[PDB]
Amino acid sequence: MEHVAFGSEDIENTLAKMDDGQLDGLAFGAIQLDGDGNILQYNAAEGDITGRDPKQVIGKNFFKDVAPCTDSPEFYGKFKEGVASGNLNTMFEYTFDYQMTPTKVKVHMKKALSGDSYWVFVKRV
Template sequence: MTERLRFESDNIFNALADMDGEAMNSLPFGVIRLDREGTILEYNLTEGQLTGTDPRKVMGQNFFRDVAPCTVNPQFYGRFVEGLEKGELDTVFEYIFDHQMATERVKVHMRKSGGEDSVWILVKRL
C-alpha cells in the first residue's frame, strides 16, 4: 500500500489514519500529527531524517515551541491556528526549514484530521 501512496494522493490522509508505525516510517516523505495545542502525536522516521531529529525524543513535545520554532510565523503556525479556528484546514505551501539544520526547502500539506481533533502535516523535500 505504501508503494502506491504518494504525497499528492487524494486518499493520503485516510490511508495514514489506518497505518501502523512501520508503514508510516517507510513513506518517502515526512509525516507529523499534532493535537490542537501542537503536541506531537506522530513523527515518522523520514521526518526525523529530514530534520536530524530522533522521532522517539520528540513525541509529546510541542512542535512549534520545542521542535521547530522556525515555524512560529504567519505562513506556518498562522495557518495552523486559523484553520483550527475556522474548523477547516487543508492547505499546501512551500516552506524553508532552517532550525538547527541545513536550510531545507520543502512542500508542506497541512490538513485537519477528519474523525479526530488533530492535524496531519506532510513534508516533502523539493
C-alpha cells in the same frame, strides 16, 4: 514501502489505518499534531529530512519547542486558523533552518479524519 503519493486527495483516509510502524514506510515526512501543536506521531522519513530522532520529539510542542522557525503567520498562523475553523488543507513551500542546514521543503497540512488531529506532510524540493 507504503505506496501513498504526497498530496493525494484522500490521504487522510489512507493514513487512518497506519500504526507508527506503517507510517515509517512512507516516501515523505509525516507528523501528526493535536490542536495545540503537540506531536503525536513523527515518522522516520521526517527524521531523515530534519535530523530529529522521532521518539524523542513525540510529546513536545512543534511550534514552541521543536520548530520555532514555523512560529510565524505563514505556517503556525495557517495551522491555528485551521484548528479554529475545523478545516484545513493547504500546501506551500517553506525553509527549515533551526539548528540544521537550511532545507527547502514542500509542506502539506491537512485535518485528519479523526476529530482533533492534524497532519503535516513534508518532502524535499
